[PDB]
Amino acid sequence: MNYPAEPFRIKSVETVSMISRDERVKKMQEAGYNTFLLNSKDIYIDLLTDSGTNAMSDKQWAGMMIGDEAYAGSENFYHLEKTVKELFGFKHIVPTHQGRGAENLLSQLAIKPGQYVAGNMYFTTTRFHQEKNGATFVDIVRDEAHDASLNLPFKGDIDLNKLATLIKEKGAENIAYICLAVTVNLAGGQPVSMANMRAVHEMASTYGIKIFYDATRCVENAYFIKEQEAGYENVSIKDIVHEMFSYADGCTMSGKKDCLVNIGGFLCMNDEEMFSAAKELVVVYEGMPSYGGLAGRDMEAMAIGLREAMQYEYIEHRVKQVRYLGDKLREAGVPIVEPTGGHAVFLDARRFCPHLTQDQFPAQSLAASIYMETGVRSMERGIVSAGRSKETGENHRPKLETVRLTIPRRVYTYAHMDVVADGIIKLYQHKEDIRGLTFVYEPKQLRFFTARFDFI
Amino acid sequence: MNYPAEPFRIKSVETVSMISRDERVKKMQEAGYNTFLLNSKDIYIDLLTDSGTNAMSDKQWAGMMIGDEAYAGSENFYHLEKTVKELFGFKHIVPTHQGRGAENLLSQLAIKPGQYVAGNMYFTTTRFHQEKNGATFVDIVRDEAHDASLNLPFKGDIDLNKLATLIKEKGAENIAYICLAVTVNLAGGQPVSMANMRAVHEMASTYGIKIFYDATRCVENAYFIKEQEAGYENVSIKDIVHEMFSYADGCTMSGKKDCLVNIGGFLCMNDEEMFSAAKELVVVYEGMPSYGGLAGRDMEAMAIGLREAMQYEYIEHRVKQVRYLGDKLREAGVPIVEPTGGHAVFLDARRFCPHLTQDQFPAQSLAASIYMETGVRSMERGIVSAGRSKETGENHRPKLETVRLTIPRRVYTYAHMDVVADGIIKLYQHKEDIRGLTFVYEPKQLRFFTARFDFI
Amino acid sequence: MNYPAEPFRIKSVETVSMISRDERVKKMQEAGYNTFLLNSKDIYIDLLTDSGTNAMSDKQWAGMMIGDEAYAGSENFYHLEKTVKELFGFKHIVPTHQGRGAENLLSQLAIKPGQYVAGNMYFTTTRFHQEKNGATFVDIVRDEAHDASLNLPFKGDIDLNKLATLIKEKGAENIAYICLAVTVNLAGGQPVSMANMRAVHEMASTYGIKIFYDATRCVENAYFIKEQEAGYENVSIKDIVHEMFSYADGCTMSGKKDCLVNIGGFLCMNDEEMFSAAKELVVVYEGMPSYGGLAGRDMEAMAIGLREAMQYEYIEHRVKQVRYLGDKLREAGVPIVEPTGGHAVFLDARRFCPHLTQDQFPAQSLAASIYMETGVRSMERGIVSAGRSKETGENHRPKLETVRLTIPRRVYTYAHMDVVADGIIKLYQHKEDIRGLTFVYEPKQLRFFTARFDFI
Amino acid sequence: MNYPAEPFRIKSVETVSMISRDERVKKMQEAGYNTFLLNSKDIYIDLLTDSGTNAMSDKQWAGMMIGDEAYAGSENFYHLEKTVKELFGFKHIVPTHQGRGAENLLSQLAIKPGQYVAGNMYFTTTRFHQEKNGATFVDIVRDEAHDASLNLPFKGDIDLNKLATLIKEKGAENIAYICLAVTVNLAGGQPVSMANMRAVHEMASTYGIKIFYDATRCVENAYFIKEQEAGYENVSIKDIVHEMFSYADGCTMSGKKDCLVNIGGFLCMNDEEMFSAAKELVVVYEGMPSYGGLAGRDMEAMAIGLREAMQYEYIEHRVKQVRYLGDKLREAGVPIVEPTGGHAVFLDARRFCPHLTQDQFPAQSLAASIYMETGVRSMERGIVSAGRSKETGENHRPKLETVRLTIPRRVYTYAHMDVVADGIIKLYQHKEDIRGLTFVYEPKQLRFFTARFDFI
Ligand SMILES: *Cc1c(COP(=O)(O)O)cnc(C)c1O
Ligand SMILES: *Cc1c(COP(=O)(O)O)cnc(C)c1O
Ligand SMILES: *Cc1c(COP(=O)(O)O)cnc(C)c1O
Ligand SMILES: *Cc1c(COP(=O)(O)O)cnc(C)c1O
């Protein structure tokens, strides 16, 4: 019922051009009705992603001025190494320019062809490197996680029965590692309980199976645990995060998310053998282990942001601001995925546009409409992005045809949230007016990135 | 009824420490219950002033990086000179480190001992330099302006009958110049209509009297003209600002206000004789005419800021965010000054605390309570600031005993406004609880700046 | 005989702590006499590498303030794409966090198992990706390039007879592409003449072979052409660079070198098929094609830096400052690699320490001595870095046992060069005093990065 | 004989346009042969002044990012106050936008009409405020200080006999205060010995007279004391500065000089009465005592800069880089003022152009020639700047007809010094070629700032 005011003041702003609706319609047109083809400069509120779109603090910007760009022995690296070792509790750290860079490394080092990798759902880049290195992905998340309507807490929890069964039918020796993600993106940014992580660790530990977290949004997960897990009411975010990682053997992290930066990531591990091997591999892909594809100034900004992310008031507002958007939409009966995750709100384009068939790209059309009416860009996560089968050469028909409204950290206000909520509510009240779309140009690769459409 | 969402995104934020109510009470104690003694770091929302507390843009910060610190011929100066000439339309410009710097200059140049200076109300620093140079200030603002309850538009307007009479009982030749201020600070930030400026210029131009504006908040004034003056509904802010100045002979500007900067100001004029004399005088007070006590980077930032302030959406949201605070307070029956100005909301401490006599400093105590309860700093504008008579050595009893809630530009959100509004409304419901204050230490000079008190 | 003064002024400085010789000796001891283990903060002059250690301009820092961090459609991306298209002349560009990131991409896209890749010498990362993807590297550089004493111009040139013979003995169809590097690192930073680039292109065009440049230091190369190639005396650096690339099908670029930045790189190509395939591949390794693992601000700084690098006076001073260090050392009879390249000076550790056998690591010891005596860090490029055979498990005995003095761009002065030169000349006069080293700890991987030694 | 290398690295550079000699000649022409009219952008090396043209450090730029712009209680002010109290040892400090601002204040507070002000020579701004406030300036520096050819150390010392006599012929009660400047500008930047500061204090103390230091270049002074005063060889710069100020009652400081900043200054004092009165006066001229016309970020940069100036290596290089220029010039027989000061070199235009009469403006023409030949800008300090009498309406004929070459801190290299020294040596060897100048346009005020000339 209550939403907190920003636990910070605005130090500097990014000016935006408020173009008319007539202009937005023309721009949408030229973009082929594909929000991905829109120019950043032509967008008022950009909710395409929460990756690298964060606003830094004055302290981080101060850190950006004292970048020690030395190839080795940089003071910024020591700062990052010390901070991560202190907060995550891992023994070694290898910086990487992004989260995927770390995933490429881990997968090349922890997977042997024909092995299995079990995890609670997946993410495109992380799953790619897994399979790329000869492994078979096995989803062991609870089934309720797949129910977009089920309003249940900790939908990202792993189903221990599915895990135990896997171990039984394939053998511990055949499971490279368990990839536990926090939060679970695919499900809408759903958290994992501390009880589950503890339980999975107990089982895996019994069979000597490795556990690597995809901690890109571990602080948001930390907040849900503090908010909804019994006994964690009075535990600090910092302490919750420390315990979370005490059940993992390492992790891949995208600083571009919860580390409050615009670039940066890293790989963590306790194993010395794996650390030494990782050091040799990072050289050819990211750079020396002393900087890993990151400028010294960026390692400083990331070490600072990680620390800023631990402030309760900051994360509470971050998550509640997303909750605010979901709440407003739910109050008007707009079809969204439940419950609201920590970083975004997903709209059910299917239920939103019942007059359209998935083959008429409702999610893509909804997104286009959202921009023309409010100037906010959202990302289509439906049939268009799902792509079309290689063999049958036909469109994949994903279970969910959604439009994702992803919120960057510390960039928008509740007033901005009202602009997108009011705009979508108005669209919903006249949803029959939303037209279907058709391909006028469909590239072969990355079709969602450059395909152009036209109304049916 | 409707308030616009911020026409910008947050680029960087200023971290703030949220200290408990207990700590705030302790800090206020140590500060002698005087908000002017509180440490900036101990304040959540600082509404002490709108001067130099503005948030700059990414474009301004980029300019901050290309400062041409040359003692002469700096590129930044040319940028500023070109901008001001374009936007204000004046012939010459002399930069100064602050608005007062410009006033000191114009006063030493346009005033002759015994001459008179008429204007709509006054400001401390400006009137000082006026008198300091042997001149008598004559307030020619409409009487209604003095009525804090009269909800009347353009209260800052000049009484043309009060003027004509002045010219009559004293002689044009005895009036140095007319000091028209936009907006009028003393009344609460009230605007002056274009019709008034034009009429004043018509009369003065007749008797050859000089007109110099105090344009510190000329852009807020322009917004009121576009919003409430008939015929300007469709005129651009830029076009309104240009005409405003077409009725003046020069001006003194405080970039710290409407120029969206943290430091800076300038003096403009068309007279070449005055310009040449100004050049000679600036040398000994601010610095060369080519920089006047401002770093190159700051002249660049100010040139950029002035341009940014011309954006309608920006100024509209600026003024409306202040209106929002006023509306919320009025809705709860809190006594405030009417109508709401463009840069601040003034609380009527007299009506707020009817259980306290002015000699118990209601405004001062109201300000201390507001901080201890919400963490927001406000400024007292009553008996404590009015000081005490030199002769009678007794406290001056100002007509209005108010607490000023001044809003910096682009720094806070409506959520922030709700924090100060809900806290003052709650205080009002239990106003009888507010205690009177007493001097435990009263400096002789700048008492309001360092005086310390204690509860009665 | 003449060296030009810096074609720029200092805008900001990086403070350094000048520790004593006693302190430096203690520091060196603690670092196991390995310069790779020294803290950047304990170094006065760091000549470890010219990679990402460059000093940016005020215009570049201004650009760092206007980063459009949008996931797609960023204004900075357009700035970089337009700039590179204009200066390099390639049709398409794909940004990468670094040069290796672009190499990984090109190798995966242009090599098929069993094919051959011919080039003028090689670089560690680039060769790794070549072989990693199933190709056999063939060195076709002129034989003189291997004679470190031969003072001959354009030692980086490709031997057209070696290339023609390759095409003859293996079949044009079996040659993935020709990898022409400018300048040639391994030889000491030696240039490639325009005549050679044109001839190579003529032959390759005949057989339909692909040509991709490893342009990390193409601007330094351009200067040498302007300085020593007949007919280019009056051609602009900008025009020479455009012609160079007119003979290639694409290129991999490390912005960390000649683009005057601390991070960044990119992949260029004219072929649309390859461009489409590269776009799909960059996603999983670097990021969207619209940012490729680089923050928007960095794409802006790299675009600006590339344009700054085209100024003749800047590149002339850059190369000549390196020539200055080499001239001073040569004048004193200190053994170095000839002629001096464009980014570094290589000391011949073998001839420097004739009292030591390569097995006693002369280059590693010379490097430790240079730091203890002057406070400047250099990199060992000899037996330690060469490593030990995997099979025989024995140290590789590289032909050249050197110490590299790599000069960052726009970071040091001639006075700093005098410091390293005078210290090295002094050490040379008592070279017999340099002690041999022995491993006290030899890691299995990246041994030159963390190995620790002790005097013999 | 030996000159130290820069004790810092270049973090960022200010690019410059290297226009040809033909262009420079064209530019000088349009500037009316007056260097004060040249655009900063058309200059290579700007030696107009060392005021506010300094290069800040990466640490200072970091401080610029955390500017606490609160009107009162700013953290940056506490940082500055604490730093000055600690380094200078004074009780109170009142910041001002510039040093003049501090002079204006002190003059108004400590001078009573008719009183006398004695000091070692004078400076324009400071002397003005002295006389403007009804006081007579009495020069009590040693007579040797006026001998531009006398290579005598500590020419800035006060002749104690001249002082004692003053106190005798006028009475201590009639002497406002003693203004001791460190260093002494008018003489060329000459230092005052610690023994003299101690002596003067001992005498003034006896008669209860006041001593205020014009410490704008107190760190350069401190270096000379450490270098040439017996017994201070082993005292830290920090400790020398502390003792220096222990003999004063306060001081006016221009951070634009030795504080390594581009703007800012302050007034120091131990007297509470003066402090309180100073607080009331600053409000109307600079701003609140809590910022005094300075942005929060600038107080931070000044606090950090002051500390950086205390590094022996930095100040030694600073003074020795200027010495280097004087040494090169003297070695070629070029007529300069002796000895070389700590911040500038003065050329003797009279002896430089013996073929010209002061009436033909040799200094002004020399300055013009220096620019057309090298691209460096210098300041005319002869007849043109001396102006012409108000009564007789004729040109004043200053004792010294010089061209001042003032060096900013941390902006140029020795190579830049060679460019100016080599160009001036070449002009000297053909001095007879320097032509006389004649006014083509002479303003009445600030004639040196905008007068235009032409060759006779
Ligand atoms: C964003 C993300 C990653 C890593 O991608 P980044 O761009 O590389 O750093 C990994 N997992 C999840 C669940 C993510 O959301
Ligand atoms: C703030 C203000 C000024 C100028 O003061 P600043 O600090 O000097 O620049 C002048 N007039 C009014 C009405 C003001 O509100
Ligand atoms: C530096 C370099 C590269 C690319 O490496 P970076 O770190 O990745 O960008 C490629 N080739 C040569 C010859 C280089 O010197
Ligand atoms: C520079 C200087 C001052 C002060 O002038 P600034 O511009 O105001 O701060 C005072 N005295 C001397 C001797 C100076 O050199």
JSON list of C-alpha atoms in Angstrom, two decimals, chain C residues 332-378:
[
{"chain": "C", "resi": 332, "resn": "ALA", "atom": "CA", "xyz": [75.93, 5.16, -25.51]},
{"chain": "C", "resi": 333, "resn": "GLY", "atom": "CA", "xyz": [76.49, 1.77, -27.09]},
{"chain": "C", "resi": 334, "resn": "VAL", "atom": "CA", "xyz": [73.60, 0.08, -25.31]},
{"chain": "C", "resi": 335, "resn": "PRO", "atom": "CA", "xyz": [72.41, -2.95, -27.33]},
{"chain": "C", "resi": 336, "resn": "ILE", "atom": "CA", "xyz": [68.91, -2.52, -28.78]},
{"chain": "C", "resi": 337, "resn": "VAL", "atom": "CA", "xyz": [66.77, -3.91, -31.63]},
{"chain": "C", "resi": 338, "resn": "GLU", "atom": "CA", "xyz": [67.03, -1.99, -34.93]},
{"chain": "C", "resi": 339, "resn": "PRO", "atom": "CA", "xyz": [65.55, 0.13, -36.23]},
{"chain": "C", "resi": 340, "resn": "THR", "atom": "CA", "xyz": [63.32, 1.59, -33.49]},
{"chain": "C", "resi": 341, "resn": "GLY", "atom": "CA", "xyz": [59.65, 0.79, -33.98]},
{"chain": "C", "resi": 342, "resn": "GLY", "atom": "CA", "xyz": [56.80, 3.18, -33.39]},
{"chain": "C", "resi": 343, "resn": "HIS", "atom": "CA", "xyz": [55.71, 2.18, -29.88]},
{"chain": "C", "resi": 344, "resn": "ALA", "atom": "CA", "xyz": [58.65, 0.68, -28.07]},
{"chain": "C", "resi": 345, "resn": "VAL", "atom": "CA", "xyz": [62.40, 0.16, -27.69]},
{"chain": "C", "resi": 346, "resn": "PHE", "atom": "CA", "xyz": [63.71, -3.37, -27.18]},
{"chain": "C", "resi": 347, "resn": "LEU", "atom": "CA", "xyz": [66.89, -3.90, -25.19]},
{"chain": "C", "resi": 348, "resn": "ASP", "atom": "CA", "xyz": [69.03, -6.93, -26.09]},
{"chain": "C", "resi": 349, "resn": "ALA", "atom": "CA", "xyz": [69.41, -8.62, -22.70]},
{"chain": "C", "resi": 350, "resn": "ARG", "atom": "CA", "xyz": [71.82, -11.14, -24.18]},
{"chain": "C", "resi": 351, "resn": "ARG", "atom": "CA", "xyz": [74.37, -8.51, -25.23]},
{"chain": "C", "resi": 352, "resn": "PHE", "atom": "CA", "xyz": [73.55, -6.39, -22.21]},
{"chain": "C", "resi": 353, "resn": "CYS", "atom": "CA", "xyz": [74.55, -9.20, -19.84]},
{"chain": "C", "resi": 354, "resn": "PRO", "atom": "CA", "xyz": [77.28, -11.26, -21.53]},
{"chain": "C", "resi": 355, "resn": "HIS", "atom": "CA", "xyz": [78.23, -12.67, -18.12]},
{"chain": "C", "resi": 356, "resn": "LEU", "atom": "CA", "xyz": [74.90, -14.46, -17.81]},
{"chain": "C", "resi": 357, "resn": "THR", "atom": "CA", "xyz": [73.55, -17.50, -19.65]},
{"chain": "C", "resi": 358, "resn": "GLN", "atom": "CA", "xyz": [69.94, -17.32, -20.91]},
{"chain": "C", "resi": 359, "resn": "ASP", "atom": "CA", "xyz": [69.16, -19.95, -18.28]},
{"chain": "C", "resi": 360, "resn": "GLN", "atom": "CA", "xyz": [69.89, -17.35, -15.61]},
{"chain": "C", "resi": 361, "resn": "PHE", "atom": "CA", "xyz": [67.19, -15.12, -17.08]},
{"chain": "C", "resi": 362, "resn": "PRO", "atom": "CA", "xyz": [69.14, -12.04, -18.16]},
{"chain": "C", "resi": 363, "resn": "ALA", "atom": "CA", "xyz": [66.08, -10.13, -19.45]},
{"chain": "C", "resi": 364, "resn": "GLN", "atom": "CA", "xyz": [64.10, -10.76, -16.26]},
{"chain": "C", "resi": 365, "resn": "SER", "atom": "CA", "xyz": [67.05, -9.58, -14.15]},
{"chain": "C", "resi": 366, "resn": "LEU", "atom": "CA", "xyz": [67.78, -6.58, -16.33]},
{"chain": "C", "resi": 367, "resn": "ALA", "atom": "CA", "xyz": [64.13, -5.56, -15.90]},
{"chain": "C", "resi": 368, "resn": "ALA", "atom": "CA", "xyz": [64.29, -5.87, -12.10]},
{"chain": "C", "resi": 369, "resn": "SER", "atom": "CA", "xyz": [67.46, -3.79, -12.07]},
{"chain": "C", "resi": 370, "resn": "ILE", "atom": "CA", "xyz": [65.92, -1.06, -14.21]},
{"chain": "C", "resi": 371, "resn": "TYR", "atom": "CA", "xyz": [63.13, -0.61, -11.68]},
{"chain": "C", "resi": 372, "resn": "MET", "atom": "CA", "xyz": [65.31, -0.68, -8.53]},
{"chain": "C", "resi": 373, "resn": "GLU", "atom": "CA", "xyz": [67.58, 1.90, -10.14]},
{"chain": "C", "resi": 374, "resn": "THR", "atom": "CA", "xyz": [65.07, 4.23, -11.82]},
{"chain": "C", "resi": 375, "resn": "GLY", "atom": "CA", "xyz": [61.56, 3.39, -10.72]},
{"chain": "C", "resi": 376, "resn": "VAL", "atom": "CA", "xyz": [60.43, 2.55, -14.25]},
{"chain": "C", "resi": 377, "resn": "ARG", "atom": "CA", "xyz": [58.81, -0.79, -15.02]},
{"chain": "C", "resi": 378, "resn": "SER", "atom": "CA", "xyz": [59.64, -2.68, -18.19]}
]
